[PDB]
Amino acid sequence: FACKTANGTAIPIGGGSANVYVNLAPVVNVGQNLVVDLSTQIFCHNDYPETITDYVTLQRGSAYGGVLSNFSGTVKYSGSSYPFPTTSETPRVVYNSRTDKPWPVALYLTPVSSAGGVAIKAGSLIAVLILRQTNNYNSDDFQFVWNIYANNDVVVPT
């Protein structure tokens, strides 16, 4: 089991960490959503589906910078929504194919009432999402840490 990002940066068997750069809507008003869909950014595959079943959860999701201070939101994982920052580990998603499959996680963020101006700075860390991978084969328990960075400023009209 290993993963790779849209631009090809990968985290090998055993886990590790990688940065994911995302382009964000430049203008987001209070009452509107800023959707950060990682399903088009992070992909993983099972290296031995003939024998092993891989289990993948969103172990933890944390907010940073402009997202931590100016937005409120939830994280959608494999069809279900949870609080973000996360309060617990999500249920497992099975990976049983050698073909790359998307990691079904998306952040649904919305400006807080007092949000205004540059709510998110270009190049800043907005979130850290931890993908935890285990299996039905051995004691492997690995973390694939995804550091989500904003490619541009996000402005909230005042």
Ligand X SMILES: CCCCO[C@H]1O[C@H](CO)[C@@H](O)[C@H](O)[C@@H]1O
| Contact pattern for ligand X over residues 90 through 129, marking x by CB under 6 A | ----------------------------------------
Q: Which of 24, 41, 54, 75 binds ligand X (CB under 6 A)?
A: 54
Q: Is 48 in the site for ligand X (CB under 6 A)?
A: yes
Report, in angstroms and rounded to the nearest whole number, the Rg of the chain calculated over CA atoms.
Answer: 16
Q: Is 144 in the site for ligand X (CB under 6 A)?
A: no
Spatial distance between the Cα atoms of 29 and 31, rounded to a whole number of angstroms:
6
Q: Which of 117, 137, 151, 157 binds ligand X (CB under 6 A)?
A: 137
Residues that bind ligand X (CB under 6 A): 1, 13, 46-48, 52, 54, 135, 137, 140
